[PDB]
Amino acid sequence: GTYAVAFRLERGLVFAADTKKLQLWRQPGERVFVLLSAGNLAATQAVVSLINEHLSQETDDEVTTLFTAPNMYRAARVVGDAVREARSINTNFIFGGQIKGERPRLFQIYPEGNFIEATDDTPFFQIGEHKYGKPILDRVARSDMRLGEAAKLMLLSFPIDLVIYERDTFDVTREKRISADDEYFRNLSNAWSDALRQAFSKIEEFDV
Amino acid sequence: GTYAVAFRLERGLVFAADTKKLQLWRQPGERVFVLLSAGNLAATQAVVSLINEHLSQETDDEVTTLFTAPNMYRAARVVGDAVREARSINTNFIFGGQIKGERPRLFQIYPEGNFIEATDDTPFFQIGEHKYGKPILDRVARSDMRLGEAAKLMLLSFPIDLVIYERDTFDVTREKRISADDEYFRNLSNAWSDALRQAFSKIEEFDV
Ligand code: NA
Ligand code: NA
Incomplete structure (x- = not known):
């Protein structure tokens, strides 16, 4: 049982996971990918191993891998396939990154390998047994935030x-x-605690 | 799957539950009790029915009921017995109230009928599948709050x-x-949303 969260902003992407529950792939100057997991260690390893198996040993050109995916939607489908197929060996994954010629993109992957994409309206995802602090993110997160303030x-x-x-x-x-x-x-x-107490002190003006 | 929360303050008690997941017993001028449940309807009804069975039909004087309990610790044990015995017919309960001659008291009851009591340091409990907004309560809740501001x-x-x-x-x-x-x-x-955004705007001054 762990927690992870990611934000898609105008300026890029931010990923965070506690305890590896954060996994990186990269081709310098061409593509970068980050996977976040909230499943147990066996589930995470199974998905990562399938991704890496195709990167390291795939003989069939038409089988898409993270390094042959022409765009991030196609890359998300690769991860989706791995997530679904890893069931053969109950948490969502977060997957994002950027491929040259396209903006950075961020996805939430479900157990069957279907997914949804982050938008300006819904610029973040949370995964894990407890989506800690969801109300604060809902109310405060904005897609035009600087990367450091999102972090x-x-x-x-x-x-x-x-x-x-x-x-x-x-x-x-x-x-x-x-x-x-x-x-x-x-x-x-x-x-933050001091600021929250001050925020509550202001709004207790209002009746209910 | 529902959520409930209660606060013990210097000035009294506050209880809240969504959707009955909030149950009341009273003897005017002598005692009041509130039970909050986050279990399914069968679990809630079983516990309440056992409490009411003893209030309505108990023939043995030495068997403690909510209306014969000399103090709130003893009343909590009554509810504990009902919670444990209802397993014969995976959520905690919250139980609080006041009996004449003693301060108001608040308890969290576990599945085996054991319990913990709210203190000035830990003046609230949350129950349910998701303990929604726990961080905000941890940071902002104080035992000297007015009843309306706690609410x-x-x-x-x-x-x-x-x-x-x-x-x-x-x-x-x-x-x-x-x-x-x-x-x-x-x-x-x-x-609150406006105040949170302002609170975050202040504290983003700080590096990490
Ligand atoms: Na804005
Ligand atoms: Na205070």
């Missing part, structure tokens, strides 16, 4: 593996592990 | 049945059903 919002909804992907870079450089002893994260959390 | 905080964590119990009154007069079309509740919720 901060995501972190407050929760060590945590955090990846910030900047649009059109086709690399994952901003990768970060944040522990419970991280003093920056504690300072942010304490300020 | 507002509880409502934001979510029709909803709301009971406010004022200390030493031994009656439940402030009983309220709040629908999705309630304009007061919509106004409160909209203000």
Whole structure:
């Protein structure tokens, strides 16, 4: 039982998962992909192993892999196929990234390998037994947020593996592990609590 | 699958449940009790029926009922016995109230009829498949809150049945059903969203 969350913004993608429940693939300057899992270790490994089997050993050209997918919809279908086929060996996955010639895209993959895509209206997904802090994300998340502010919002909804992907870079450089002893994260959390109490103090003006 | 929440404050008790998942017993001027359930209808009815069976038909004086319990710990044990025995016919219950000569008290009852009591440090309980908005309650709930402000905080964590119990009154007069079309509740919720966005705008000053 773990939790993960991802945001699609105008400026790129942000991924976060606690504890690997965050998996990366990359061809420098051409494509990057991140998979987040909330299933047990066997489920995660089975899906990743199927993806990697086709990347490493596929002999049939017309069988699409993450590195031959012409766009992110097709890449999502690859992961969908792996998620469904891994049942042969009860959590959703999050999958996003970018392929050259197309904007960054983000998907939520269901157990049967069907999926939905993030939009400007619904710019984030949460997976896991508890979708921690969903109300705050619903109310505060906006698609025009800076990547760092999205990351901060995501972190407050929760060590945590955090990846910030900047649009059109086709690399994952901003990768970060944040522990419970991280003093920056504690300072942010304490300020958030103070701000919440102040926010509630304002709105208790209103009757119900 | 439903959600319920209760708060113990200096000034009394507040109970809320959505959809009866909120059950009331009373002897005017002597004792009041509220049970909240998050189980299915059969589980709730079984526990309530056992409580009522002993209130209505018990022939043995030494068998404690809600109306013979000398204090709220003993009353909690009565409910615990009903919760455990109802298994003979996977959710916690919340049970609180007041008996004359003692402060108001609030308990969370587990499947085996064991329980824990609310304290000034931990002044609330949540039950149900999803403990909606737990982070906000953890950060904002205080035991010295007015009953109405506690109610507002509880409502934001979510029709909803709301009971406010004022200390030493031994009656439940402030009983309220709040629908999705309630304009007061919509106004409160909209203000909360605005306040959250402002709270996040402040604290994004901090790095992580
Ligand atoms: Na905006
Ligand atoms: Na205080």
